[PDB]
Design an enzyme around this catalytic site. Sequence first.
Site, PDB file in Angstrom:
ATOM      1  CG  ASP A  36      -1.802   1.352   1.434  1.00  0.00           C
ATOM      2  OD1 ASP A  36      -2.094   2.027   0.294  1.00  0.00           O
ATOM      3  OD2 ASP A  36      -2.243   1.488   2.179  1.00  0.00           O
ATOM      4  CG  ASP A 232      -3.960   4.705  -1.932  1.00  0.00           C
ATOM      5  OD1 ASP A 232      -3.351   3.590  -1.596  1.00  0.00           O
ATOM      6  OD2 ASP A 232      -5.254   5.055  -1.381  1.00  0.00           O
TER       7      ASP A 232
HETATM    8  N1  LIG Z   1      -4.310   3.087   1.355  1.00  0.00           N
HETATM    9  C1  LIG Z   1      -5.431   3.692   1.758  1.00  0.00           C
HETATM   10  N2  LIG Z   1      -6.043   4.512   0.909  1.00  0.00           N
HETATM   11  C2  LIG Z   1      -7.039   5.474   1.252  1.00  0.00           C
HETATM   12  C3  LIG Z   1      -7.539   5.340   2.830  1.00  0.00           C
HETATM   13  C4  LIG Z   1      -6.755   4.447   3.482  1.00  0.00           C
HETATM   14  C5  LIG Z   1      -5.668   3.466   3.153  1.00  0.00           C
HETATM   15  C6  LIG Z   1      -5.138   2.520   4.023  1.00  0.00           C
HETATM   16  C7  LIG Z   1      -5.987   1.225   3.886  1.00  0.00           C
HETATM   17  C8  LIG Z   1      -7.072   0.745   4.150  1.00  0.00           C
HETATM   18  C9  LIG Z   1      -8.502   0.835   3.188  1.00  0.00           C
HETATM   19  C10 LIG Z   1      -9.586   0.723   3.625  1.00  0.00           C
HETATM   20  C11 LIG Z   1      -9.812   0.574   4.838  1.00  0.00           C
HETATM   21  C12 LIG Z   1      -8.938   0.487   5.916  1.00  0.00           C
HETATM   22 CL1  LIG Z   1      -9.129  -0.061   7.659  1.00  0.00          CL
HETATM   23  C13 LIG Z   1      -7.460   0.667   5.486  1.00  0.00           C
END
Ligand SMILES: Nc1ncccc1CCc1cccc(Cl)c1
Lengths: 389, 395
Positions: A36, A232
């Site tokens: 990630d 991302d």
């Molecule tokens: N990679 C990401 N991109 C946007 C926002 C958050 C993240 C972190 C990964 C992630 C995605 C959804 C739920 C959770 Cl609990 C963690």
Amino acid sequence: GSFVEMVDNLRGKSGQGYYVEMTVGSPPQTLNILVDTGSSNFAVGAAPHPFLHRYYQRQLSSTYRDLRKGVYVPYTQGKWEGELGTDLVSIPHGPNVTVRANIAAITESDKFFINGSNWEGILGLAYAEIARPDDSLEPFFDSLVKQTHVPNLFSLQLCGAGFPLNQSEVLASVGGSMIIGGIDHSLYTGSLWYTPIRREWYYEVIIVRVEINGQDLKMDCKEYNYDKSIVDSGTTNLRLPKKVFEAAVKSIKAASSTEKFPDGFWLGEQLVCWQAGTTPWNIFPVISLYLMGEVTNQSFRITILPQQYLRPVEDVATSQDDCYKFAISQSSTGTVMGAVIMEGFYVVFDRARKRIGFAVSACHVHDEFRTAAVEGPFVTLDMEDCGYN
Amino acid sequence: EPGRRGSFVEMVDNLRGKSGQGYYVEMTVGSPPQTLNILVDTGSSNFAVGAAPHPFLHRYYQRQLSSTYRDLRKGVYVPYTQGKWEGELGTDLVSIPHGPNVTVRANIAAITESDKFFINGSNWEGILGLAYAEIARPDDSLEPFFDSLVKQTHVPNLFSLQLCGAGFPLNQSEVLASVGGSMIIGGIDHSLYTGSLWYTPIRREWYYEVIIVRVEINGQDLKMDCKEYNYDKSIVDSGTTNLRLPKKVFEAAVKSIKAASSTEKFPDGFWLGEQLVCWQAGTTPWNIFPVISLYLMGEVTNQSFRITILPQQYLRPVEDVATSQDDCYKFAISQSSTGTVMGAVIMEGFYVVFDRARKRIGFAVSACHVHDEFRTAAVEGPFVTLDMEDCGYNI
Ligand SMILES: Nc1ncccc1CCc1cccc(Cl)c1
Ligand SMILES: Nc1ncccc1CCc1cccc(Cl)c1
């Protein structure tokens, strides 16, 4: 440049994420970890969960070190709770090194783990500024570079199959490559074009122009980066700011007007299917995102096909139809170049030179008439004004 | 204004017990009548009584001494996670001394074997399952007691419960002498509550299932998808001590309750509902603990109401292992893997009306709920709430 030992070390898909194998503790405990670039914490399941068939067992690691501190990471889409500590970490199909890094042992979570994803943790590759609880918690990649001679750079080739992969298939298929410390030339074609990393927190970039089948969306370029634009791999879709999303969907709808689709489709909620092999790729437009270049007043563009923004999904009846979901959605936190977009390119995260490179991916899905592209240069003025402050 | 009258004096104060061991009512079975104390349980649907010697029973149902006993020649096995009981089915004449002046023939499960069912010192020898036939063991053909009662008499199809927690520990002698509340069979007694009654629909007739649409901790919205609050169901169960919440909801709630009460640090064992915490006599810091509000679906479209409980309800009084003069309690909220359970803890704050006839459950502030000079439990409404149907869970 060739790193055979790291090529094809990824598995997964845009809908559930791409992951790489890692080991933590002594003796080594093997875990599949989501790659990630949109976060900065190394966190792994450390307690039983219905979606996990294995997790990090701290009491079984002789090299485990308790930091005696908790960490709560809430997101709009989900959240995870953990206990901080450190341990020895390695990447079997990566550099031949072992480093002591921070590890968040996840004890509680809400919509974090994905049923059937096959991964038990996450590897946040972004910078310390966005690390939880604060920037004092050194991210994994930072520990890696500081503790070894591995170059401060990594590249990602995410490979979408172009069709649905069932449970067994996704476990056997090669989902791509994560080259740690270098660039493997076999993973792309054409030249690499670099856009500057505006600021070192998320991997932030600046989009200066957007086209739908060559037609300029004609919006103030600041709208494209409101309030930021990032790469991302932890997000599935290409997400665009509300106003940009609305304009883009209008244009995409116009370009594909020979066929009408229900509102649910455009909301990325419901799928659309076509008889086997008849997906009308040609009626959907290509999308071009122009990015700031490293040379003053110079930009370049990356072009994706519907093969990228239409995500292959299995039909409820598991019929032989070819079905997809619209992988472009609305965002309230800026533009997000998710897995959907990355699948079309080989992306170089050149941390050392504060830049991100893009090249057409050797594994991007296309047809005999069109291909993804990375082309330049173009003369573009006042690109700095496109950034949000 | 207008003062509300109490019209069911014969049934008022007919209960005894406490949240930790259950509330019971006196009943008689057989001819001549055999008196037994029976646990009032809205979380099950079988009328079962001890019918054989047991270490924790001082008396039991003796079928051979009842001229009206009828053998059904059928066995029944009722296993639960926390316990189980086995019995032989039959029917007999049943009455409630401090209840309607009627006698009916109902099904009775004569308990012959059990494990962790009977509680030493609870003073009850049986259980009265007041829920619907759908969850009756062995199956829905075994008509529950209340159904028999309504079908055989003119008693209205409705009952109400006022469970009265004392607010402090009750020793064996005290719990036997203290009035633990009221079970009004066939009506509503206005002397048992203050304010107005607000009704939430009974979603489905099996357990007394309801739908929670919003949860607040000291006014702060827990902000979870309301579906989480009812996963996989939400019920009102007098047979359960604690307020039990789905795993994810419990985790979110405990975190918020911890934050609200952060001026005081409590051991993990406390939050796990396993160990007690004590304060010098009379110094319990009620004010540092938050009130908890559960918003429930109302009977009018897009309308909801809320019930608010105080720590006086969710902190259960327990005796110190050293029987000192300290005031001690256990945290009476715990996680569940079977949905939300509004147990005795919560019911003690309100007068609860099980309006079977109109398929609804009413809530009103209880006249016997424990509180302090600064805060009181509450039942308030209405609130505009949309898409409440989406809060309900579907397999
Ligand atoms: N990679 C990401 N991109 C946007 C926002 C958050 C993240 C972190 C990964 C992630 C995605 C959804 C739920 C959770 Cl609990 C963690
Ligand atoms: N009312 C209930 N609620 C939840 C689960 C079970 C019951 C039935 C009452 C009960 C309580 C403890 C042990 C047993 Cl053996 C039965």
